[PDB]
């Protein structure tokens, strides 16, 4: 609450997972790709859209 | 004759090569090579058959 409520800068504070060997961070993980060679701009929008 | 590789260039997202070879018709036959002229130290243009 202290800082993620600043327009100054994001301050996302968090704890590591149960087994540190895989992560630094809990929950899920994935990658959006570019199989067409659409270029950076589309994929960047796709990230936000998503 | 021996298509020289010079550097890369991006193509639709991807690093690919840039080759530099003489025209097809200038490397077909034994006398076809006498066509290729070189530089002369004194600025002039020395032939290959020389």
Strand content of chain A: under 5%
Specify the structural class of chain A. mainly alpha
Order of helices and strands of chain A: H
Find the count of extended strands of chain A (DSSP E, 2+ residues): 0
Separation of the first and last Cα atoms of chain A: 25 Å
Oligomer designation: part of a larger assembly
Helix content of chain A: 10-25%
Tell me what the structure shows.
The structure is cut from a larger assembly and holds two copies of chain A (50 residues). The first copy, chain A, is mainly alpha-helical. Chain A is built from one helix and no strands. Chain A is flat and about 40 Å long. Chains A and B meet through loops of A and loops of B.
Labels describing this entry:
multidrug, Multidrug resistance protein MexB (chain B), Multidrug resistance protein MexB, 50 residues, 20% helix, membrane protein, 2 chains, mainly alpha, part of a larger assembly, flat, transporter
Topology, please?
This is part of a larger assembly, with two copies of chain A (50 residues).
Chain A: H1 40-49
Sum this structure up briefly:
Chain A has 50 residues and is mostly helical.
């Amino acid at each position: 609450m202290h800082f993620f409520s600043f327009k100054d800068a994001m301050v996302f504070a968090f704890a590591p997972p149960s087994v540190l060997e895989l992560g630094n961070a809990t929950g899920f993980d994935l990658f959006l790709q570019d199989q067409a060679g659409v270029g950076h701009e589309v994929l960047l929008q796709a990230r936000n859209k998503f | 004759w021996g298509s020289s590789y010079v550097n890369d260039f991006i193509d639709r997202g991807r690093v690919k090569r840039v080759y530099l070879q003489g025209r097809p018709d200038a490397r077909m036959n034994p006398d076809d090579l006498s066509k290729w002229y070189v530089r002369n130290d004194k600025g002039e243009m020395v032939p290959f058959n020389a």
